Amino acid sequence: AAKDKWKLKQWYVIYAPDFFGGVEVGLTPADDPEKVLNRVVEVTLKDITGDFLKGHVKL
RNA sequence: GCUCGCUGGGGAUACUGCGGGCCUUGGGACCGGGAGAGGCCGGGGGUACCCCCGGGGUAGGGGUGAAAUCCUAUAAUCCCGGG
Numbered sequence A: 001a002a003k004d005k006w007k008l009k010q011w012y013v014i015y016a017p018d019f020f021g022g023v024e025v026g027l028t029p030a031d032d033p034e035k036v037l038n039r040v041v042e043v044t045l046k047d048i049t050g051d052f053l054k055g056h057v058k059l
Numbered sequence B: 001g002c003u004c005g006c007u008g009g010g011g012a013u014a015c016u017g018c019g020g021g022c023c024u025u026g027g028g029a030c031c032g033g034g035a036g037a038g039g040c041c042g043g044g045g046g047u048a049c050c051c052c053c054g055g056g057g058u059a060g061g062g063g064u065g066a067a068a069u070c071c072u073a074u075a076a077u078c079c080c081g082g083g
């Protein structure tokens, strides 16, 4: 039954804000889309703009 | 010699005391550019920690030299969003 519970969940794609490019930053699972609101994701500036210098900047 | 103590007079003016004058070195007052977790009062913050509410997940967590009391299915330890 535990496995069955895990099968009810759908995966949602997370996008960066408009002025940062709006690119895809990841995927998160949930059964009800209302539970996705107010979740937070941490990404480095190197992930958005490719440069091996600003790897220590976290957004 | 001892009772080193008292008293009538004369002389000296280096030091101490007293009176007058004149100083700036000790001390104090004031002005300049700086130093400091010195003190008091008002405002704005930093992580950490404890409790409460909502989501996830499920059988352990904590603690000692070794254990046990203790906490946990009225859902803990752990992770996330708020107060």
Ligand SMILES: [Mg+2]
Pocket (backbone or CB within 6 Å): none
């Ligand atoms: Mg809960």
